[PDB]
């Protein structure tokens, strides 16, 4: 009856809506079997202390699923890792909704953890989705590399491997590196004249102000920048017509909470009509066995879902991260912010407003400028040569 579904959240205000949400959930799929309970504690300061609490409080109440959001005030320096670890033992699925840096994506260091917020690696899918219909194919890639740097390019290649086409070189430089202008000549001396960029805010600003003297900006020098490069302090540095970017929901955790609890309620309503459900233990103390009803839960959480929530239609992929995310293409036009259309996901729908490419042109210049490069190479042999 008391199918506890905890949710470690932000300050009390952001946790307030849960007790109102559970009543709606308790009423929609109502019966004398799904009388849920809610136990929650905010993101405590430090990390080890909260890791104690999640066993001191949450599984000490014998919970069945965990929901986690981002800390309200600080940055992503101390995102909750131990939740994926403390719940990592019993193999219970854990649902995140806002924390996003693409490290959590692979189900190898975090076993089982699905997110309703898509990591930045999907920009590569979006980048492909529009570079197909833009009359250019050859592309130059620039990115840092801590963990995400390899991920974006590797996904871009997993996409550009079935078309027998290949991109150009990728320039991997350590995060937080200045005076990196040496590689700009090496990239410039090549036919392709479109650039892919992705880095942290400070790194983007450094490699950004380290390019004006060198004439990387102008017509035929279209730049590719994601929300990481645009959102932050690097806003007041853009050229005349760079490609902005922006997501739909952002800080709208209420709708995410509603959709997540609806999906979880449907899944647990199916689950209650299943085989034996192991009673969750007293918690961390004493017992360290294996919760046999762990992967069974994610066996259906990963699949299906298909709920109709406020955020839209959620569809998780084979490895957690959802699919079919609506998206608002942004554009910077001389220190201004205007959109170009709506990327609903897997369908390209830009509007017919005014767009400006770098250099002020409004056209589709070739991915590689001019022509007549090809180099002959033979070997002295026979009357042929």
């Amino acid at each position, epitope marked *: 009856k008391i199918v506890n579904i905890g949710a470690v959240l932000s300050t009390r205000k952001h946790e307030q809506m849960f007790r109102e949400a559970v009543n709606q959930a308790n009423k*929609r799929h*109502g019966s004398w079997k799904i009388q849920l309970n809610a136990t929650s504690v905010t993101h405590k300061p430090n990390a080890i202390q909260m890791a104690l609490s999640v066993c001191e409080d949450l599984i000490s109440s014998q919970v069945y699923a965990i929901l986690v959001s981002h800390p309200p005030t600080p940055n992503d320096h101390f995102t909750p890792t131990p939740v994926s670890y403390t719940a990592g033992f019993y193999r219970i699925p854990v649902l995140g909704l806002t924390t996003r840096m693409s490290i959590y994506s692979d189900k190898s260091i975090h076993l089982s953890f699905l997110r309703t917020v898509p990591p930045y690696s999907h920009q590569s899918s979006v980048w492909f989705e529009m570079m197909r219909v833009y009359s250019w194919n050859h592309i130059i890639l620039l990115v840092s590399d801590d963990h995400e740097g390899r991920a974006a390019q590797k996904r871009l290649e997993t996409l550009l491997e079935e078309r027998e086409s290949k991109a150009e070189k990728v320039l991997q430089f350590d995060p937080g590196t200045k005076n990196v202008t040496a590689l700009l000549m090496e990239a410039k001396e090549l036919e392709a004249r479109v650039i892919i960029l992705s880095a942290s805010e400070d790194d983007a600003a450094t490699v950004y102000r380290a390019a004006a003297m060198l004439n990387m900006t102008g017509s035929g020098y279209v730049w590719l920048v994601g929300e990481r490069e645009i959102s932050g302090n690097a806003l007041r540095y853009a050229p005349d017509g760079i490609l902005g970017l922006q997501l739909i929901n952002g800080k709208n955790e209420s709708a995410h909470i509603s959709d997540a609890v609806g999906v979880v309620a449907q899944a647990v309503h*199916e689950l209650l009509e299943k085989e034996n459900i192991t009673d969750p233990p007293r918690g961390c103390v004493g017992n360290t066995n294996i919760w046999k009803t762990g992967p069974l839960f994610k066996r259906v959480l990963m699949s*299906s879902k*298909y*709920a*109709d929530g406020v955020t839209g239609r959620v569809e998780f992929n084979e490895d957690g991260d959802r699919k079919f995310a609506n998206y608002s293409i942004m554009n910077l036009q001389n220190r201004k912010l205007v959109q170009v259309g709506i990327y609903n996901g897997t369908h390209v729908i830009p509007n017919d407003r005014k767009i400006i490419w770098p250099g002020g042109e409004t056209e589709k210049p070739r991915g590689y400028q001019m022509s007549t490069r090809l180099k002959i190479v033979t070997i002295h042999q026979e009357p042929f040569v």
Partner: antibody
Amino acid sequence: EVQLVESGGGLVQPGRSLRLSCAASGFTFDDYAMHWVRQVPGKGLEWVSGISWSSGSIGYADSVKGRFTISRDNAKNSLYLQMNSLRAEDTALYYCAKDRASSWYAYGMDVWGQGTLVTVSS
Amino acid sequence: NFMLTQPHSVSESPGKTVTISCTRSSGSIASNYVQWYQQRPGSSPTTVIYDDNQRPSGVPNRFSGSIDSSSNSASLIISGLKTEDEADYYCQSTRVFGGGTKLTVLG
């Protein structure tokens, strides 16, 4: 547009099985589960069954055990709640219906089909 | 289980408000979403009010919803007019339908 087309309403001798087929048109079928409510001459309706958006989840009300079964296919856009061993109480107005979501535990109802007459008597 | 409560039939002239109440006997009325359904004679049934206050897309307002428990009851209120307000009203809360109400125009 949203419309649950149903036909094949007629008279069947009690005890014999029946084969009903309700088709759809317009909206996308995948994102919605299909309900099965019916009225009866002289009284109101009662919720009976709901088939999941693809398969697996099937729910029944208090008196829907045994011959009162549901089935559906998501290939040729048909709904196949078929009846076997019918009795006199089964003579009523039958509607094939669809939930507002891919599940049916909420009993959310919209687009109330067209109606079919299954007759079971002497 | 539980049984709802709907009036057998009500009559109202055009230009006057009409009320149709669905009263739940066992359990809290608000504990389950009562859903008002309208079924015109000789036509496919339609929805009017669900989750105790909601109009479907395309419904020209004019249909409210009362969920005040009071004596463990709920009701549907329609603004005063009898243009096409002659049908059968069905209330459903959870797996159970009411007796039904028939509204007639005054001639």
